[PDB]
Amino acid sequence: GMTHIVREVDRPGSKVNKKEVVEAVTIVETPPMVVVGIVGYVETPRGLR
């Protein structure tokens, strides 16, 4: 889904600076990745094999 963030901006030389900024921000659920396989590649004169 998507939410807001009220964010302090530490970027000097702007009207944005030292003020709160509301932004359109997405959320991505990421479960941990279970390692299964190993693949090797050989440099060929047509690419990778």
């Binding site: 889904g1 939410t3 807001h4 963030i5 009220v6 964010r7 302090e8 530490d10 970027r11 709160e20 991505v28 990421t30």
Partner: protein
């Protein structure tokens, strides 16, 4: 989620951010409240009790 294949500063990457408020209003419609305790404390008792 792929790592960036080049390194850039640009005064847009590698800045310490400060999160202040992340809203959790009702996205199924127009959101009116933040938390369930705040919603119950604002609306008071109903026929559910």
């Amino acid at each position: 989620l792929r790592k960036s294949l080049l390194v850039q500063t640009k005064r847009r990457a590698l800045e310490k951010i400060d999160l202040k408020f992340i809203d959790t209003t009702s996205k199924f419609g127009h959101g009116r409240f933040q938390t369930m305790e705040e919603k119950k404390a604002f609306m008071g008792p109903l026929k559910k009790d």
